[PDB]
Amino acid sequence: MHIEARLFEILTAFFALAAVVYAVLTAMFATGGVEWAGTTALVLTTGLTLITGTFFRFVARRLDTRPEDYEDAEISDGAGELGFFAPHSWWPILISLSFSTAAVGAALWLPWLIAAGVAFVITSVCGLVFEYYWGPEKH
Amino acid sequence: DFAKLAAAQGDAIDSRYHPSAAVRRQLNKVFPTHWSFLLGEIALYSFIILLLTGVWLTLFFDPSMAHVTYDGVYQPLRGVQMSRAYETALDISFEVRGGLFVRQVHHWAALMFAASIMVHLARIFFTGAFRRPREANWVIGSLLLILAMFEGFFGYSLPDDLLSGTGIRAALSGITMGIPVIGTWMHWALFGGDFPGEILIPRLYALHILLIPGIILALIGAHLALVWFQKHTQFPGPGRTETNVVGVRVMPVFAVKSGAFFAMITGVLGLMGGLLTINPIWNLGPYKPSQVSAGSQPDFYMMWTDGLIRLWPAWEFYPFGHTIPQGVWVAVGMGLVFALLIAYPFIEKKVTGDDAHHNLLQRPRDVPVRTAIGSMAIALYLLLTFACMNDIIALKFHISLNATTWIGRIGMVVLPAIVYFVAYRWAISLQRSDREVLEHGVETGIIKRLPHGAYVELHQPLGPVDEHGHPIPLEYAGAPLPKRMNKLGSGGAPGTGSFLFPDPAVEHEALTEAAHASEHKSLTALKEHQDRIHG
Amino acid sequence: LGGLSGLALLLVFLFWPWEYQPFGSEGEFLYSLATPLYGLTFGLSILSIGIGAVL
Amino acid sequence: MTSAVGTSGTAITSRVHSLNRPNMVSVGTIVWLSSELMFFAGLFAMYFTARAQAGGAWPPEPTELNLALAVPVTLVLIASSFTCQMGVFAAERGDVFGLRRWYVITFLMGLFFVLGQGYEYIHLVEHGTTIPGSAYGSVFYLATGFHGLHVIGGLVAFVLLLARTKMSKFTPAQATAAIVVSYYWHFVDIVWIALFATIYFVR
Amino acid sequence: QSALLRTGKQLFETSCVSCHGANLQGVPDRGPSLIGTGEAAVYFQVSTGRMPAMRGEAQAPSKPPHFDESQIDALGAYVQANGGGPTVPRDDHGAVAQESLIGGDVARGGDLFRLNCASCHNFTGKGGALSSGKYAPDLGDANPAQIYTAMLTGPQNMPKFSDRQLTPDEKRDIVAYVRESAETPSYGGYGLGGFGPAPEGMAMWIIGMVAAIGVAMWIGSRA
Amino acid sequence: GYGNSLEWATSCPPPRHNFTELPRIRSERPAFELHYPHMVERMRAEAHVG
Amino acid sequence: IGAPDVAFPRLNALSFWLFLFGALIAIAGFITPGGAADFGWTAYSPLTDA
Amino acid sequence: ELEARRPFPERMGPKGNLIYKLITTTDHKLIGIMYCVVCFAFFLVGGLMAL
Amino acid sequence: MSSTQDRSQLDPEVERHTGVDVEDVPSAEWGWSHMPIGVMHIGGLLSAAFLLVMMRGNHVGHVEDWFLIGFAAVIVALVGRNWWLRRRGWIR
């Protein structure tokens, strides 16, 4: 987790530099000082990269070299129990349809449709989140 | 001494009468415990509520077209000529305490009655509950559904209303007048004259509070008697066969849950009658032949009729000095529709040839052709219903009214075909999912094989395992299969303390191994009964 | 809870500002949720009784 | 079906072993939170460009920010973040019940924050400022209301995850789910701290 | 007024000359002639925001006003001076009379509405669909003056109810009924729009059926 | 032929889960090294020359 | 990368479906009588206001 | 020494082996194929617009 | 582990020998699984004919007729492709 961390610290450094130079060169040499739109966007994309890179560096320090992060690693080194990978599920399409219902209720100003879409989204997200935890029916 | 009193009353009843044998026989009757089998109950429950509400409404409703000035509380209709029926509907809404609530829950119960009948019909159709033992049931049920629809029409038509009045004008007057040979004669008999005939609303009142509810009650009695004595069908399962009913006896369990379901359905209907406004007739002035509204729909169970009117392309025929109006078409439509609904099991047995006594239901996926046909019928019904709402759909969802009309026109031919194809392939795909889970077992998380980098989903066999890893495939038996280890005994033992605090470890243990033993004993008993059936 | 809801239904039906109030008149708001309260209390009562029976 | 093909305690397990490998769900939620930061960046850009274009009195005369109720809600949000972190601490352990208690009180504090924000919204609305009324009113309401929608989503996640912990034996996967929900809540209240330092402090 | 007409001309010369000629005669196949439309037409059309139309389609929709009350009056006075036509009602002060346009009678206003307005709008003033891409918008938003001017000038596919069909008394009565229906709470719970059968059936099939089927699934088993 | 990327080291219609046999990844282009072992050394030798 | 699947594969299925239906609703501007979005792709502000 | 292979691989596969997969498939490869097919559907919709 | 295999004796009744086979439809015996291709093609032709005949009505516009023509042509093309493939034995 060190290489993909360093990637994000490099991106964070560049974005911080770009935001700082934009702010300095717009606060003066511009008609209305700092643009306040590009400046904030650059600052918070710097923040985006900073959060991701900080988490990656934290994990990398927390983690011993993984086989994937280790050169000269045999395939048998990584062999073993991989985690749960969700098999077939029809809940994603229902979530998409629910959000589409809410989106059309938003575009077409139909507050009833917005509410129905929000209810559908909550129901479908519950179904997805609970899909692999719903215990057997007890009768 | 309540125990002694109960014993004495039982002895009196069994001394005067001798129902011990019969009473035991019904109290022991077994009813399957599938949720879908409760669907029909909803309709019955809704029906009961309607009766209980309907009688109440009869104590305050005066059916008549006698013109009168309101002179009542509702200011926006004062001095306006209205039929006495509309005046009394307004009085119920405003003048009698709870009258708005009572008629509101009555109309909501009518809508739930219709919708639950439709859902029950779909259930029995897709599950094939109409086969050899129970065609007559189907048939009467079909008739029953039809009656409900018409009574609903006669229900919101009772309060002489602009919306309901224009609905009467379109449907009854126009269509009856359109029928070629006797159409005008039927119109004059039904109205005792032309459309505004002064004997329409009283006749509809008689048909709606006395005649049609009585016929529906008689048909419901026949329906429930047949289901009771043609003991309910069941889905395939472990210990379930064509010659037994696996479930819960009537008295301890089935009666309690049925009564609780009636209570909860009544609660849903009361909550709707309070919080949701149904047919706000006061906004709808008294019916006048000239006044109009843009919406002008009937209740959802006749929206398919209205949509069929809208989408049918204005085709008329003109014989020798006679006219055959386009309205005629819808009548024929209904005929065919009903003629195909009432008769369907006989067409099914004539085409397929299944003339066997079928007691085990069929999963809809296991009958791709019938599932596709039912999906096609539901698609056509939905298309027609939304076509009736094409006015409102265009208003809210910005689509040109002509565009919606032509979408419906092309759809009533194309959408059924697409839905049939999709439903057929979907049913076969569900069958293949079942076969795959049988032949491989349930799926789980992925693991990377030790020596090489093979990735395997780490299945779970549902049956005996071969000498090597792969199991012996099982044989499909028409019962649902577990596609998720979720629903098996995997990761399903949360702390039984409480939501906030635990219980002592000894108590949690006792409870969890008790539940484990109970469910294992249930499985063992079902398996032993299954083996004893054949073996 | 079903019992308290039934008692609330009795109390609201006996003592609540029902009756049509002309648009704009003070107390129209109380009327506007009179029938909603009737239905709410009745439905909660019977629904909760049914829920208790099912449980 | 001798005993089992997959010798796993639960049908659902951690998507990667968190001991020697990164918690993959944690990485995914961190990435998504980093993106939602840039969404809030769009909102902040709107507000800031509106601020630059005022005639020296950025909150119009009709609008008068109710700091008396605004400070308490921020305090409640940071307290909810602390209790969420306590819920996480309980989650790393097998103590599902402590996790549930901590997350329930966090949910209550977040709901109280939402209720207080609604109260302040109605107070501002009755005294003039509204979305269709003024540029300040519109930008303020838009930013704070999208944050409030995020808070409501966090409350939804809290209730859903408590229910999920109720329906299965508390697994390391459930602990990771609780941890990612806590990450989302921490993002939510951090964004609120920024929105308070801008809307109410910097003005 | 001289300054009012000057301001109206200034606003007109740079907002609508493209659709309507500089002499207010409609540009062919872009916009109609504004000669004789009147101050009432301008007020209703611009206060509702329709007039900076920005497209030629089946139905010009309502949108936020592009001019403020004073500018609305300036444009309306300009048009009134050019052609001469209906004028927006005004009270003693001089502003666009809105409170004074609420007729006392509502039952008579209700009959007038149902005979004339409900034909396409609704029983209770909601919207309605029209032939091809057109519709009748909801009356909830329109203020009394806007309703009055809409009746007094049929914007597009609206019958123009002259002062002789609906005398100021009848127009005020209809305005009163419209406002009363729009602002009156739906007695008997949340009024699902104004259309009965369609929202009512949809709400049945969603709320009641989902609840009943979910309760059946809870009570019943699966197999 | 002469592919890279580890994507051509699995049955051309890839099995569910993408692999039944994973090569010992030694460079950017494991599939080429698997299918052409003799070039492995060459790949390491001529690489730097450019 | 030699992986069996994507990190959150239900999530990528959700992404695909969210795309399909979002694109469908965006394109559905054409069925409306007014038509689809007339403002340029870039959709600069005042031209996009109500 | 010789393998028993079909003369030509299955062209289409058995009826109804795809619809439920599309509805439920969690396999990334199938989702990518769906992406490509839908994306060219859209690339024709656009492009016809261009024509 | 809480589950048990099920077996069902279902009354079987045509003798499910002509039409569909379990390989094509895994639950052929369990219920109606075959709709003849003849009724397919006849219904498709009837749908196309209905689409054409709706061109005759009361509508001055012609976008509607063109959409009808396009949809009916699509249906006829699908039915023709299916019929040709069936006649040749699902080739091309």
Ligand code: HEA
């Ligand atoms: C990926 C992006 C992309 C692609 C591939 C193309 C491809 C093409 N574009 Fe592009 N174009 C843009 C992106 C793209 N364009 C953008 C972003 C703009 C600016 C938009 C704006 O100003 O807002 C633009 C603008 C633009 C204009 C200016 C229009 C205007 O603003 O006035 C023109 C004019 O000819 C044009 C032409 C073309 C042509 C002739 C092609 C050809 O390459 C297209 C190839 C054609 C096809 C592939 C169709 C063939 C298929 C069929 C006939 C089958 C159809 C069947 C069904 C639909 C069932 N484009």
Ligand SMILES: CCCCCCCCCCCCCCCC(=O)O[C@H](COC(=O)CCCCCCC[C@@H](C)CCCCCCCCC)COP(=O)(O)O[C@H]1[C@H](O)[C@H](O)[C@H](O)[C@@H](O)[C@@H]1O
């Ligand atoms: C469950 C329902 C599913 C739908 C089922 C049906 C599917 C079949 C679709 C058939 C499409 C047919 C479209 C043709 C229609 C047509 O013929 O009309 C035209 C207008 O074309 C159009 O809009 C194209 C519309 C195409 C959109 C169809 C999209 C499918 C949607 C509906 C699917 C979503 C379903 C979601 C359901 C929700 C769940 C349900 C439980 C022109 O009218 P007009 O407007 O008057 O134009 C005048 C000129 O005439 C005149 O010359 C010119 O001069 C002008 O004046 C002009 O005005």
Ligand SMILES: CCCCCCCCCCCCCCCC(=O)O[C@H](COC(=O)CCCCCCC[C@@H](C)CCCCCCCCC)COP(=O)(O)O[C@H]1[C@H](O)[C@H](O)[C@H](O)[C@@H](O)[C@@H]1O
């Ligand atoms: C078990 C049943 C539980 C039911 C919940 C009961 C809720 C009780 C609500 C409170 C008491 C009754 C309110 C009666 C007062 C009242 O009616 O409520 C209107 C609101 O109405 C709307 O707009 C909709 C607003 C969106 C929120 C409500 C949505 C609730 C839906 C989702 C519940 C039913 C299910 C439908 C699902 C359908 C989805 C299908 C997938 C509010 O006024 P307003 O907003 O201004 O209405 C405009 C006039 O002004 C103006 O003139 C007029 O012309 C109009 O423009 C009018 O809209």
Ligand SMILES: CCCCCCCC/C=C\CCCCCCCC(=O)OC[C@H](COP(=O)(O)OCCN)OC(=O)CCCCCCCCCCCCCCC
């Ligand atoms: C996308 C949503 C639509 C577009 C984006 C909107 C984003 C806004 C987000 C949060 C703000 C909510 C806080 C609302 C409370 C703040 C107070 C206020 O807004 O001001 C009062 C005004 C009247 O002002 P007035 O006429 O001058 O009369 C003054 C009376 N004396 O009410 C209003 O219109 C406010 C109503 C706003 C409701 C927004 C509902 C959002 C839920 C959408 C669900 C997700 C859809 C998915 C789409 C992909």
Ligand code: HEC
């Ligand atoms: C279908 C014929 C028709 C009838 C008759 C009719 N309307 Fe309309 N109405 C329309 C149309 C179309 C519009 C759209 C106006 C526009 O687009 O400029 C409209 C618009 C309106 C508006 C504007 C509301 C807004 O928010 O823009 C009001 C108010 C109104 N009508 C009230 C009435 C009244 C009052 C009557 C009875 C005198 C009536 N209508 C009769 C069709 C009609």
Ligand code: HEM
């Ligand atoms: C059996 C199925 C029934 C259905 C589907 C049904 C349906 C309806 C509907 C939808 C209404 C409209 C109410 C309104 O809009 O206010 C209505 C009205 C009415 N119903 Fe029925 N009903 C049924 C049974 C009954 C029964 C048994 C009675 C009498 C015991 C009855 C008496 C009435 C009366 C008097 C009215 C008019 C009163 C009013 O509208 O306020 N109904 N019916």
Ligand SMILES: CCc1nc2ccc(Cl)cn2c1C(=O)NCc1ccc(N2CCC(c3ccc(OC(F)(F)F)cc3)CC2)cc1
């Ligand atoms: C029309 C559509 C409609 N538009 C609107 C607009 C607004 C509103 Cl609010 C409601 N609507 C509706 C509406 O609700 N329609 C329901 C409806 C339709 C037809 C009938 N029909 C019974 C049988 C008759 C008949 C047929 C054959 C006969 O021959 C026999 F059987 F052999 F004797 C005898 C009589 C025809 C009328 C009932 C209800």
